[PDB]
Amino acid sequence: NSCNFNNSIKNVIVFYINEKALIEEKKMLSCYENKLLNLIKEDCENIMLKYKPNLSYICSLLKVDDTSEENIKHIKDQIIESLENDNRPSVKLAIISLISMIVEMNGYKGKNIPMSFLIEDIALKISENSEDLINFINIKNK
């Protein structure tokens, strides 16, 4: 369907987060990636709508107001650790929503390079075993 499913998911996540940052997209999506975007966008907007206090609480724990390189690295490692602890597709969707809030809170606009790599790094980890994530969001309605 695509050449590499993990790459598709990684591209979709970076694109989505940038879209929620109101950042000009640097790269557009393929036909297949755009299909996955539409599915993920609906799920993540619904999580944001239902669990905003829960995500805001996490952001308080993560001290998202601190955009220093040291604290951004700390946020990355804590999110990666939580994902390794609970690797399910639904968790990955929740984490995408969490990143969206982090970006909306700390005012990320593309120039904080450590934050850009946080987005890249977590997109990479979410994209591992993408087959399971794709099956979850396809069948979520299919």
Binding site: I47, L55, E81, D86, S90, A94, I95, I139
Partner: peptide, 26 residues
């Protein structure tokens, strides 16, 4: 880096379980 792993984990678990419930009702 793990000081909040349990607290964050518990929050992710509740959101994930609910998403699974919606999926199960598809």
């Amino acid at each position: 880096e793990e000081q909040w792993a349990r607290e964050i984990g518990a929050q992710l678990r509740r959101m994930a379980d609910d998403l699974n419930a919606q999926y199960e009702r598809r």
